[PDB]
Ligand binder design. Structure first.
Ligand SMILES: [Mg+2]
Ligand SMILES: [Mg+2]
Ligand SMILES: [Mg+2]
Ligand SMILES: [Mg+2]
Ligand SMILES: [Mg+2]
Ligand SMILES: [Mg+2]
Ligand SMILES: [Mg+2]
Ligand SMILES: [Mg+2]
Ligand SMILES: [Mg+2]
Ligand SMILES: [Mg+2]
Ligand SMILES: [Mg+2]
Ligand SMILES: [Mg+2]
Ligand SMILES: [Mg+2]
Ligand SMILES: [Mg+2]
Ligand SMILES: [Mg+2]
Ligand SMILES: [Mg+2]
Ligand SMILES: [Mg+2]
Ligand SMILES: [Mg+2]
Ligand SMILES: [Mg+2]
Ligand SMILES: [Mg+2]
Ligand SMILES: [Mg+2]
Ligand SMILES: [Mg+2]
Ligand SMILES: [Mg+2]
Ligand SMILES: [Mg+2]
Ligand SMILES: [Mg+2]
Ligand SMILES: [Mg+2]
Ligand SMILES: [Mg+2]
Ligand SMILES: [Mg+2]
Ligand SMILES: [Mg+2]
Ligand SMILES: [Mg+2]
Ligand SMILES: [Mg+2]
Ligand SMILES: [Mg+2]
Ligand SMILES: [Mg+2]
Ligand SMILES: [Mg+2]
Ligand SMILES: [Mg+2]
Ligand SMILES: [Mg+2]
Ligand SMILES: [Mg+2]
Ligand SMILES: [Mg+2]
Ligand SMILES: [Mg+2]
Ligand SMILES: [Mg+2]
Ligand SMILES: [Mg+2]
Ligand SMILES: [Mg+2]
Ligand SMILES: [Mg+2]
Ligand SMILES: [Mg+2]
Ligand SMILES: [Mg+2]
Ligand SMILES: [Mg+2]
Ligand SMILES: [Mg+2]
Ligand SMILES: [Mg+2]
Ligand SMILES: [Mg+2]
Ligand SMILES: [Mg+2]
Ligand SMILES: [Mg+2]
Ligand SMILES: [Mg+2]
Ligand SMILES: [Mg+2]
Ligand SMILES: [Mg+2]
Ligand SMILES: [Mg+2]
Ligand SMILES: [Mg+2]
Ligand SMILES: [Mg+2]
Ligand SMILES: [Mg+2]
Ligand SMILES: [Mg+2]
Ligand SMILES: [Mg+2]
Ligand SMILES: [Mg+2]
Ligand SMILES: [Mg+2]
Ligand SMILES: [Mg+2]
Ligand SMILES: [Mg+2]
Ligand SMILES: [Mg+2]
Ligand SMILES: [Mg+2]
Ligand SMILES: [Mg+2]
Ligand SMILES: [Mg+2]
Ligand SMILES: [Mg+2]
Ligand SMILES: [Mg+2]
Lengths: 172, 159, 48, 58, 185
RNA sequence: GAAAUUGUUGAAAGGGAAGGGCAUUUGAUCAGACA
RNA sequence: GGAAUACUGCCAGCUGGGACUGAGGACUGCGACGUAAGUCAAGGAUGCUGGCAUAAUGGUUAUAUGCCGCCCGUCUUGAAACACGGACCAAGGAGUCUAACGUCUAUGCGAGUGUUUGGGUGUAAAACCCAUACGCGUAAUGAAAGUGAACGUAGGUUGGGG
RNA sequence: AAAUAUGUAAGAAGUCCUUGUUACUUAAUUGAACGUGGACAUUUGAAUGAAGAGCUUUUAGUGGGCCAUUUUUGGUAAGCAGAACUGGCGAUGCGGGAUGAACCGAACGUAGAGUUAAGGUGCCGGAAUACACGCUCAUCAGACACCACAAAAGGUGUUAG
RNA sequence: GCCCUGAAAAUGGAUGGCGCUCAAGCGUGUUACCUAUACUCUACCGUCAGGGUUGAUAUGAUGCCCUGACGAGUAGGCAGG
RNA sequence: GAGAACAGAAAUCUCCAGUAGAACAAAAGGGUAAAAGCCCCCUUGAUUUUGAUUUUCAGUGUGAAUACAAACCAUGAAAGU
RNA sequence: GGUUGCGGCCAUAUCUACCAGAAAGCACCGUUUCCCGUCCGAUCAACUGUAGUUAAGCUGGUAAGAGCCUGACCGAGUAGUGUAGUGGGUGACCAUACGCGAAACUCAGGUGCUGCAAUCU
């Protein structure tokens, strides 16, 4: 759906005389803007509670920024999604530098591997994996080995003119 | 071939309401109609004399005549691109006083009052109705009510 | 009375464009129609 | 040689050009079809009160 | 495009000149549009339009319909105005004085009016005596007395008179006009 | 003494039709306006 | 603990490059700047300079080049149609006149109106004039014999331009 | 027992006080209907809109229709036959879908400048052989709505779960 | 999920064609860019509407002057030529 | 259902239960319980006059129907019908 | 408060099984000359209110009673549905966006209210 911000969203059903001060519920929501974010909120509250937007109210909406945006983190990611013929729960692991970055590559991944558009996905949880070795998926374990190094073979430089007088070299 | 008699297609319309068959209660006959009164029209299937045609079921018109066992109701019916005036002879069993008017009569009688209550005092009234307005600001407290965080829930089968 | 006084505003097409591939779905689905709340100001300025 | 049998297609377009004219409304509508016994009396009632006004202009 | 809410290029519907070619008519109109553009008197605006009207929309006014109007309370010294022709009426025996301004007076009409020592005035003479139509009573004649309108709205139960040439028993008086012959109207 | 249609002369174009629209190059041709 | 920055938004903040237009034709308005005199970008371009004065610009035409362009007429839901007519060109070639009519309009006269069967007259099919009738209208309604339009300021009520 | 659709009402032709007329009606000057006289003006009784509203005459063409989304009958089905509501085509060019009556965009006076729609931007062809993460290797790969088709089933190909 | 098998028709032949394989393919995201008789501003035509203007001593009063909006079209109607 | 000679699955007699599971010419739908069904009593309103109205509609006709007016009657203690 | 006569709403009033009911009322109840109706004085009619009785009618209370009535974020914002896309999918169908929104279910609470008139420890 885009480049994500993450939002705390807080709502409640409207007050009534016999029930002033209804309970107040919160969701974290990944969206490109607060309009999609409040929308998503109402979308999930209605899967959980007797409410809808006409009888509820948004109390607060705030963007949550990453605590340590230049610290590499190992994310565990938990998703529900629909396929062409059923619906399915999934656990993935994503290594990045923010929840927000991490969720972008998730949708990308879900679109690429499983052909799941944004409508078909529910993020259930995004959590930082504190101890390496609770890291489960090998496509990440791979990047945790000590003194890790790797070359980038077959370098291909972008030409800026249509003709060239050399004959390139993919050295690196 | 086709069939289109008078009471055609009216099986459920003129039907009688669950556990409400039999004699009509006497209040239906004690009610009183005057020319000008506004009435709703709905057929009592157990009262074959003086029945509205089904076109007029659900319809609301004005009394123009009062007769021994009936009232004459004028309904405006639209045919082609125009309305024509229609006059109905209905027995009192197929009619009731419409409340389509009380909110008005009740509002008038009230509107006079707060106008007196103003004038006599020194005006500042404002007595047209107004649509739902949007909500004003408000401050919701957290005390006793910290926000509960919910997330979406996994797929599951039960069956 | 004030608002009716104003002839409807005739605007141009947005100068830097609509920001979306397809206009006719809701703002919330990467379209242009509906309540986009305060994001209207960016659109209308681009159009005015 | 068969042909279409029936359709309302386009009929409400036609009715809306000149428009669906609302019923049109009069102060004093006709007493058409009103109880004759009533009307007979109403006729003398009115006659009576007219007299009593032209009188009051003696 | 515009989703038009009403017909484009629509003419107002009202005459704007008369259809007539008569110089003298056109002169009166020259006079009265001036008066109408510069006096804010409503009388002049009404008179301007009436000058444009076709013959049907200006039935004759009879001199007896004039005598009636002067019988209104406080109206006897008013100068009656008729934007049309004024006709005579032997049915009134006693006709009052006054001043009538009109487009045409038939021979017998100006006679009757003049014999009572009243006065026939043309519309321009009226303009000069009453630039704002002061003290003026405009009369129009019966438009829907015409024979044509007899036949407007013909149809069952409408009571409106056949377009017919010969009349008599045996012209359009049988099946459809009486209970014993098919039905009645 | 028109047109269809034809001969000659002159000019031009022509890789499975021709003719047409918007635009300009090139050739030919020409009105106007300067004072 | 104290800052910076990003992001979003605001300024009746300043300022550079480029393109198209220049309608109007005395003055008159709303303003701006000045202590003032005056000035101005304020109800639509002016200032300065050069070239040509002619096929230079422009029109027309033929051709070339880019892109685009299916035979018209017809009936049809749908025709470029593997539906019909049409090789070509001139010339001819189809809602008319009359009797009686409806609506609308113009004109004359108006409770009337209509001279033109006819007569008179003539510069002779014209123009000019006219007596008696007649036709339509001024009464309706009945199958008919028949009868035949004011209780009232020719009525009351509501709207009604003037 | 919905949703969509649907009747009526939201005032001066209104509301209140006084008490006249009749052959109707009441046991009854009781009522009913129509009135006289009196009291309250634009926050006078929701919103939005209103190149005004009403009304009259007369006359053309037409009376083969067809299509799309949705509802929907008959039929195995049909580019089949038949209804419902709207929107279109017919009667209509223009930009897109290469092509095409009906789809998408958008409805047309003669022109300049600008910006867009739907649809595009390797070359044809105006416009990034742009950026970014994956997936896919086909000895008949695949490539954009309407739309110019493919199914059960099966793979120790590869991917993620 | 993508790919592969399952997958047979008649003139030679069609993701529109060329051709394309870390795509010029499939899913998804982000910018920029191209261009409709549409939208914005302007001129000019015409149509409709609302204003102004008889005061002579010069020339169109059906005129002149200001202002606003609008313009598709078969059958068909009317209008000005 | 439970009961009574001949008498049996079915004859006729009784009590209990019974919202209609019956019946109301006829198709089917609606309606109906001190009834609209069943039994009895009195009857001719299935009559006279001429309008208005609803369905079908052109708001023509015809069929059928509704509610009044003006008669004359039927029935019932009566309201009424 | 009871009760009766006339009622309005017509089950919170109905149904099943028990029990309690003072005073008045109502009831059951005695009778067959008279009006009247029956196969039958059972019903219907009359007569007494005397001779008898709360057994029944009636009224009320009981019951993890059947029914009915009311409520709730009980189920369920579910099913269904109006509007949107050159959304997914061979298709059957299905997600999503802006709205409207049930029924069953589950649980809780209840079991006649009341008008006119007369009468009553
Ligand atoms: Mg049928
Ligand atoms: Mg009957
Ligand atoms: Mg910009
Ligand atoms: Mg820019
Ligand atoms: Mg740009
Ligand atoms: Mg696109
Ligand atoms: Mg702009
Ligand atoms: Mg046939
Ligand atoms: Mg067919
Ligand atoms: Mg047909
Ligand atoms: Mg007449
Ligand atoms: Mg010769
Ligand atoms: Mg050419
Ligand atoms: Mg050229
Ligand atoms: Mg200029
Ligand atoms: Mg100029
Ligand atoms: Mg020259
Ligand atoms: Mg030169
Ligand atoms: Mg040449
Ligand atoms: Mg081409
Ligand atoms: Mg043909
Ligand atoms: Mg055909
Ligand atoms: Mg053709
Ligand atoms: Mg063909
Ligand atoms: Mg043929
Ligand atoms: Mg041929
Ligand atoms: Mg010719
Ligand atoms: Mg002579
Ligand atoms: Mg001669
Ligand atoms: Mg003679
Ligand atoms: Mg006669
Ligand atoms: Mg006689
Ligand atoms: Mg009156
Ligand atoms: Mg509505
Ligand atoms: Mg409506
Ligand atoms: Mg307005
Ligand atoms: Mg207006
Ligand atoms: Mg017509
Ligand atoms: Mg016609
Ligand atoms: Mg016809
Ligand atoms: Mg035909
Ligand atoms: Mg469509
Ligand atoms: Mg056609
Ligand atoms: Mg079109
Ligand atoms: Mg090519
Ligand atoms: Mg290019
Ligand atoms: Mg699809
Ligand atoms: Mg295609
Ligand atoms: Mg696999
Ligand atoms: Mg291919
Ligand atoms: Mg391509
Ligand atoms: Mg892509
Ligand atoms: Mg770029
Ligand atoms: Mg243009
Ligand atoms: Mg413009
Ligand atoms: Mg046109
Ligand atoms: Mg039946
Ligand atoms: Mg009974
Ligand atoms: Mg009979
Ligand atoms: Mg007929
Ligand atoms: Mg009939
Ligand atoms: Mg006792
Ligand atoms: Mg006896
Ligand atoms: Mg006994
Ligand atoms: Mg008894
Ligand atoms: Mg007891
Ligand atoms: Mg009892
Ligand atoms: Mg219970
Ligand atoms: Mg839906
Ligand atoms: Mg779809």
């Amino acid at each position: 759906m885009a480049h994500f911000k993450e939002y705390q969203v807080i709502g409640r059903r409207l007050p009534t005389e016999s029930v002033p001060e209804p309970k107040l519920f919160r969701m974290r929501i990944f969206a490109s803007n607060e309009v999609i974010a409040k929308s998503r909120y109402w979308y999930f509250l209605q899967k959980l509670h007797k409410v809808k937007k006409a009888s509820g109210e948004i109390v607060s909406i705030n963007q949550i920024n990453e605590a340590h945006p230049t610290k590499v983190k190992n994310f565990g990611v938990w998703v529900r999604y629909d396929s062409r013929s059923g619906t399915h729960n999934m656990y993935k692991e994503i290594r990045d530098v923010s929840r927000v970055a991490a969720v972008e590559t998730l949708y990308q991944d879900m679109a690429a591997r499983h052909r799941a558009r944004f409508r078909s996905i529910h993020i259930l949880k995004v959590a930082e994996i504190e101890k390496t070795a609770d890291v489960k998926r090998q496509y990440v374990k791979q990047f945790l080995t000590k003194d890790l190094k790797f070359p980038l073979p077959h370098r291909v430089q972008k030409s800026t003119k249509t003709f060239s007088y050399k004959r390139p070299s993919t050295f690196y | 071939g086709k069939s289109h008699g008078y009471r055609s297609r009216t099986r459920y319309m003129f039907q009688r309401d669950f556990r409400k068959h039999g004699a009509v209660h006497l209040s239906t006959y004690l009610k009183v109609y005057k020319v000008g009164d506004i009435v709703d029209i709905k057929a009592n299937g157990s009262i074959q004399k003086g029945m509205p045609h089904k076109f007029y079921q659900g319809k609301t018109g004005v009394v123009y005549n009062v007769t021994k066992s009936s009232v004459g109701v004028i309904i405006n019916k639209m045919v082609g691109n125009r309305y024509l005036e229609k006059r109905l002879n209905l027995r009192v069993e197929h009619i009731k006083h419409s409340k389509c008017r009380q909110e008005f009569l009740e509002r008038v009688k009230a509107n006079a009052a707060k106008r007196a209550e103003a004038k006599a005092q020194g005006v500042a009234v404002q007595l047209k109705r107004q649509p739902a307005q949007p909500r004003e600001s408000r401050i919701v407290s957290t005390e006793g009510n910290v926000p509960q965080t919910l997330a979406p829930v996994p797929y599951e089968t039960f069956i | 009375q004030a608002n009716n006084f104003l002839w409807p505003f005739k605007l141009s097409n947005p100068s830097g464009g609509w920001g979306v591939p397809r206009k006719f779905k809701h703002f919330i689905q990467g379209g242009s129609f509906g309540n986009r709340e305060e994001f209207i100001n960016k659109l209308v300025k681009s159009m005015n | 040689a068969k042909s279409k049998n029936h359709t309302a297609h386009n009929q409400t377009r036609k009715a809306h050009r000149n428009g669906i004219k609302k019923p049109k409304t009069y102060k004093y509508p006709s007493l058409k079809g009103v109880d004759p016994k009533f009307r007979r009396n109403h006729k003398h009632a009115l006659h009576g009160t007219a007299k009593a006004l032209a009188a009051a202009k003696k | 495009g515009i989703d038009h809410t009403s017909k484009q290029h629509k003419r107002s519907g009202h005459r704007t000149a008369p259809k007539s070619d008569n110089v003298y008519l056109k002169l009166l109109v020259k006079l009265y549009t001036f008066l109408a553009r510069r006096t804010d008197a409503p009388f002049n605006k009404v008179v301007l339009k009436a000058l444009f009207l076709s013959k049907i929309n200006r039935p004759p006014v009879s001199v007896s319909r004039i005598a009636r109007a002067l019988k209104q309370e406080g109206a006897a010294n008013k100068t009656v105005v008729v934007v049309g022709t004024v006709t005579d009426d032997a049915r009134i025996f006693e006709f009052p004085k006054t001043t009538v301004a009109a487009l045409r007076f038939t021979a017998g009409a100006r006679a009757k009016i003049v014999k009572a020592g009243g006065e026939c005035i043309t519309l321009d003479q009226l303009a000069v005596r009453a630039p704002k139509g002061q003290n003026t009573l405009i009369l129009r004649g019966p438009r829907n007395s015409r024979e044509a309108v007899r036949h407007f709205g013909m149809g069952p139960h409408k009571g409106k008179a056949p377009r017919i040439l010969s009349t008599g028993r045996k012209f359009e008086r049988a099946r459809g006009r009486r209970r014993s012959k098919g039905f009645k109207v």
